[PDB]
Design a protein around this ligand. Structure first.
Ligand SMILES: CS(=O)(=O)NCCC1CCN(c2ncnc3cc(C(N)=O)sc23)CC1
Ligand code: NA
Ligand SMILES: [Zn+2]
Length: 274
């Protein structure tokens, strides 16, 4: 009756009364891995134009600039490719969610690929701005596993298509391109969620803002974020919970209440040594 607590949410999960969890994540879950929000003054990608050799921030994700000069994007790709950054506690909690059979889907706006890296299968992921895990020839649409262009990427060579010699581009969604097809999984995923989890994003921008409303009235929505802002603050529901502040502290708090602290350490353990 009245406000749910974080404890109540944990008890719902402990009781497997919630076992079809839909997760939405953004830039705020990966800052502890060493990746700042691209918009952060000083340390963000968009304020480091010089280092990438960029004329203006958005050019790195523009098709006509990329055709003119693919090297700045490939510098980012070399940095973001799997094996450079480490997933953190927040990623491993989502992994444990999966391992216990509770994760329906993880929707990510990130391109660091750290969800994949943490061991969550691709079928469980909706990578809404694309991924470095695959690549597509810009000329003939031939697909490549990301591992196929890795040597070229590491050696600062622009990878080329064996069929048409066109430039092969990692499957990152560029400006004006369509969202990936897998995003339409949202039509079935959201009516079916029995719990909505939102980590390190405020979900302020469409099309993600509207998804927060797409879960049923009775579904609890748990925000773990530095602040209560965005759609969840704009339109509170009786079963909403906010755990504000540091996301890693928020997650560790929930892990504690769930009784998973040790399983979490055993996981964060073997995985960090890989
Ligand atoms: C907006 S778009 O579809 O046309 N271009 C796709 C590229 C976007 C990817 C999502 N965006 C971000 N924005 C700010 N910070 C971050 C940190 C990220 C990470 N840790 O992977 S992704 C990210 C915006 C660009
Ligand atoms: Na040039
Ligand atoms: Zn080709």
């Amino acid at each position: 009756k009245g406000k749910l607590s974080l404890q109540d949410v944990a008890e719902l999960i402990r009781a497997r009364a919630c076992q079809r969890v839909v997760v939405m994540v953004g830039a705020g879950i990966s800052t502890p891995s060493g990746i700042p929000d691209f918009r952060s003054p000083g340390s963000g990608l968009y304020s480091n134009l010089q280092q990438y050799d960029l004329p203006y921030p958005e050019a790195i994700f523009e098709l006509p600039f990329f055709f003119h000069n693919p090297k700045p994007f490939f510098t980012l790709a070399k940095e973001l490719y799997p094996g450079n950054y480490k997933p953190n506690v927040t990623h491993y909690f989502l992994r444990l969610l999966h391992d216990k059979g509770l994760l329906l889907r993880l929707y990510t706006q990130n391109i660091d690929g750290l969800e994949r890296v943490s061991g969550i299968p691709a079928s469980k992921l909706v990578e809404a701005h694309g991924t470095f895990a695959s690549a597509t020839c810009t000329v003939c649409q031939r697909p490549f596993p990301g591992e196929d262009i890795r040597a070229d990427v590491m050696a600062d060579r622009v990878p080329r298509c064996p069929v048409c010699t066109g430039v092969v581009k990692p499957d990152i969604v560029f400006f004006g391109e369509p969202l990936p097809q897998r995003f339409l999984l949202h039509v079935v995923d959201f009516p079916m969620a029995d719990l909505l989890l939102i980590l390190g994003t405020s979900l302020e921008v469409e099309p993600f803002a509207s998804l927060t409303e797409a879960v049923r009235s009775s579904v609890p929505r748990l925000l773990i974020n530095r602040d209560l802002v965005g759609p969840l603050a704009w339109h509170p529901r009786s079963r909403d919970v906010a755990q504000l502040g540091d996301v890693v502290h928020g997650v560790e708090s929930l892990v504690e209440l769930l009784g998973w602290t040790e399983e979490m350490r055993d996981l964060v353990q073997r995985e960090t040594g890989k």
